[PDB]
Copies of this chain bind each other. A is one copy, B any other.
Amino acid sequence: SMKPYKELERVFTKLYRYGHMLLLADWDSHTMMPCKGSDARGAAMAELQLHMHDTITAPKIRALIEEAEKSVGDLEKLQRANLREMRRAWELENLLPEEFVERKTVLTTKAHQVWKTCREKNDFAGFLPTLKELIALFREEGKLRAGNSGKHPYEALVDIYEPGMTLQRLDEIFGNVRSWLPELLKEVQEKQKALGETVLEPKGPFPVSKQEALCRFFMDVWKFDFDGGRLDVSAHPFCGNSKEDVRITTKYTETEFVTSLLGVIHETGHAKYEQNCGPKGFETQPVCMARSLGVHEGQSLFAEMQIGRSGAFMEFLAPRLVEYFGDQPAFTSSNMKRVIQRVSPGLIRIDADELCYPLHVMLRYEIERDLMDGNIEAEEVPRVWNEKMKSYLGLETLGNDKEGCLQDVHWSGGMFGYFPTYSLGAMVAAQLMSCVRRELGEEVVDDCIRKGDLGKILAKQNEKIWQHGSSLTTDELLRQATGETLNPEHYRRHLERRYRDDRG
């Protein structure tokens, strides 16, 4: 009935309110909180997390969900989707026994300090005992989340971040990438080395106040609502807080402006999704949420990569760089394109350019999959990390675990099945932009970008993606939006056109 469904709605509004507090508390801990407030803040967040957990895991919720589900056809369409999303949120908290949960929590908090130091010291052997336990915990986690579905443990884990994504499809997507991208990289490198184009590096200092002003200017170009969000400073840029009050951060160095500019553009792309997330009338409910991390990172990367690193945008950007920092030879649209699209393989994933980046992701996918499968053991990670690094990026890591397998925090913090979503995001972004250019026209999109007039583009994003939140399945959403399910051929054609053909 409506009765139990509406009772669920009420419970989920309660949870949304408590989540508001947690999100604020988390935002503040990274931006405003002084160091001695840390224990108080963590104690407070833990207690509130506990209450949210007891609320969603009370016996009555399951009984409520079950009564609501027998009378499904008496609900409006969007209420039916909301009931689906409610079960999903309930299963995500309920399928892990509390004994497992506390054990995971203890190990991840342990695993963190052990990782951080070993990383800094290049000591995989000191990490390895922990790492073996993580991998056993993750394998155990997969099975629990798998439930009575018969899903592969890793699939159960990827599902946390990418609802409905199967290992079969993931293996097809990454196998597709593996068939062409390592040779594309090599082709691009040799083309760029044979050309020998002049690239003038921007010369600093770039005053941090002028960087901030430039960033806000670009947030205005993306029509960020500043009456419903903020820009501030943290050690790691992120997009956080709540949908009514979306708060992004960045970090500035005087020596360059690119990382921070492009970083803000990236987070603004996330923000636009959050600020415009529908469906309307479901604001405090789980159907009014981002569909997946791949869909979310598809929005950030649409902003950053599809618009931000384009030749057209350089035409708009260059004269703003003259205006905000003062003129210098580096500040021409042709030269800034060369700076922003420069291809240079390296060892560190977070520093990777648009082309190399998916190779870092692909390799993490394969290892994660293989560990979960039993094909390899923690023991072998360094060896296989090095194999893949030489193979995909032409670089060695043997003996350099610091910048090899120990470089990312993710496994310390109990995040397995997360990494692949980044390249899924890149693929979503390329697919969406292909559609937008098909619909609006190539010259129209280029004119919008080069003139910093994004409204027609942002409107298509809003229509196709943002207004739907989680009311549709990912497959349904992408089909409705772009004509088909997620297809990596768009990302391939984007990368070929931009890097191999220098087309923008």
Contact = CB atoms under 8 A, between A and B. Distances in A.
Interface of A: 14, 17-18, 20-21, 24-25, 28, 32-37, 39-41, 43-44, 46-48, 51, 225-230, 242-245
Contact of A44 (B20, B43, B51): B20
Given A32-B32, A51-B51, 7 more contacts: A14-B47, A17-B47, A20-B43, A21-B21, A34-B245, A36-B225, A36-B227
Nearest to A283: B40
A20 B41 contact: yes
Contact of A28 (B24, B44, B229): B24
Nearest to A35: B227
A228 B21 contact: no
A21 B24 CA distance: 9
Nearest to A241: B37
A376 to B, nearest CB: 43
Closest 3 CB pairs of A and B: A37-B245, A17-B47, A20-B44
5 contacts: A20-B41, A20-B43, A33-B245, A34-B229, A40-B244
Number of this chain's copies in the assembly equals 2
A251 to B, nearest CB: 18
Contacts of A18: 44, 47-48
Main SS class of interface, A? helix
A230 B34 contact: yes
A311 to B, nearest CB: 35
A263 to B, nearest CB: 21
Contact of A17 (B32, B44, B225, B245): B44
Contacts of A46: 17
Contacts of A44: 17-18, 20-21
A280 to B, nearest CB: 15
A46 B16 CA distance: 12
Nearest to A226: B34
Contacts of A48: 17-18, 21
Q: Which of A34, A39, A43, A228 has the most CB of B within 10 A?
A: A34
Q: Which of A46, A47, A245 has the most CB of B within 10 A?
A: A245
A140 B447 CA distance: 68
B40 A245 contact: yes
A48 B51 CA distance: 11
Contacts of A21: 21, 24-25, 44, 48
Contacts of A43: 17, 20
B40 A20 contact: yes
A44 B226 CA distance: 21
Contacts of A35: 227
Contact of A228 (B34, B229, B230): B34
B47 A244 contact: no
A100 to B, nearest CB: 24
A228 B14 CA distance: 31
Nearest to A20: B44
A228 B36 contact: yes
